[PDB]
Design a protein around this ligand. Structure first.
Ligand code: HEM
Ligand SMILES: [Xe]
Ligand SMILES: [Xe]
Ligand SMILES: [Xe]
Length: 154
C-alpha cells in the first residue's frame, strides 16, 4: 500500500495541531486506550497500578511516555512511508521486550483516531481521517512484517 502526497499532507496537517501540545494529546490518547481496552494497561509494568483517569492524568511518568511515543510516531509519519530505519528498533523492542500484539497496535490506532476526531474537527474531517487510517495501517503492516522476521507472531 502507498499513500498519495495529498494523503500525507492531510496526515501532516493534523499532526501540526498535535504538536501545539504533544503532552496533552498523549495523555488523552493513553487515557482513551486504557479505558477502551484495559488489558493494554497490563503491558506497562510502570503504569499498570493506575486505577482511574484522575491517577493517569496526574502521572508525570505517563505524560513523559506519551510525549516519547507521539514524537517517535510523528518522526515516522514525517518520513511519508520511508520509515524502514525508524521501524527497526521499535519492532524489535515491541516484539521481544514489551510483547505487544498487532491487535494492541490496532487499539492504539483507534485511540489516536478517536482523540484527533474529538479535538481537531477543523483538520480531521472524513478525508483526513481516511488518510490517517491509511498511514497507521501502513505502519502496522510494516511492523507486522518485521515482527515475523524477528520471530514473533503477535
Ligand atoms: C504507534 C505505536 C507505538 C509507538 C510509536 C511506540 C513507541 C514507543 C517508544 C519510542 C518507546 C520507548 C523506546 C522503546 O522501548 O522502544 C516505547 C516503549 C514502550 N511501549 Fe510503545 N509504542 C507504540 C505502541 C505501543 C502499544 C500499543 C503498547 C501496549 C499496548 C506499547 C507498549 C510499550 C511499553 C510497555 C513500553 C515501555 C514503557 C516504559 O518504559 O515504561 N507500545 N514505545
Ligand atoms: Xe500516547
Ligand atoms: Xe510499535
Ligand atoms: Xe499504530
Amino acid at each position: 500500500m502507498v499513500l498519495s502526497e495529498g494523503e500525507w499532507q492531510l496526515v501532516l496537517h493534523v499532526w501540526a495541531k498535535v504538536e501545539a501540545d504533544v503532552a496533552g494529546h498523549g495523555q488523552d490518547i493513553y487515557i482513551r486506550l486504557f479505558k477502551s481496552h484495559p488489558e493494554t494497561l497490563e503491558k506497562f509494568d510502570r503504569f499498570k497500578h493506575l486505577k482511574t483517569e484522575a491517577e493517569m492524568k496526574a502521572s508525570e511518568d505517563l505524560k513523559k511516555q506519551g510525549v516519547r511515543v507521539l514524537t517517535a510516531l510523528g518522526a515516522i509519519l514525517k518520513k511519508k512511508g520511508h520509515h524502514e530505519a525508524e521501524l527497526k528498533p521499535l519492532a524489535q523492542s515491541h516484539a521481544t521486550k514489551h510483547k505487544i500484539p498487532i491487535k494492541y497496535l490496532e487499539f492504539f490506532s483507534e485511540a489516536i483516531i478517536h482523540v484527533l476526531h474529538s479535538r481537531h474537527p477543523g483538520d480531521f474531517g472524513a478525508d483526513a481521517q481516511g488518510a490517517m487510517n491509511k498511514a497507521l495501517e501502513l505502519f502496522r503492516k510494516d511492523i507486522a512484517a518485521k515482527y515475523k522476521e524477528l520471530g514473533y507472531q503477535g
